[PDB]
Amino acid sequence: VGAXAXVXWXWXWXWX
Amino acid sequence: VGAXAXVXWXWXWXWX
């Protein structure tokens, strides 16, 4: 969970 | 991978 790649913001899931 | 919780920086693994 956070900023980068995964869940949160950037790549993967949620936002960015 | 990134900033927050997981691999990278903050909580979990690597740094922070």
In short:
2 copies of one chain form a homodimer. Chain A is mainly β and 16 residues long.
Label this structure with key terms.
16 residues; globular; homodimer; antibiotic; mainly beta
Describe this structure in words.
Chain A is mainly beta. Chain A is 0% helix and 88% strand. The first copy, chain A, is built from no helices and one strand. Chain A has one strand spanning 2-15. Chain A binds chain B through residues 1-6, 8, 10, and chain B through 1-6, 8, 10. Strand 1 of chain A pairs antiparallel with strand 1 of chain B, so a sheet runs across the interface. It is classed as antibiotic. The entry lists the keywords gramicidin, antifungal, antibacterial, DPC micelles, membrane ion channel, linear gramicidin, antibiotic. The assembly is dimeric. The entry is titled "Gramicidin A in Dodecyl Phosphocholine Micelles in the Presence of Excess Na+ (NMR)".
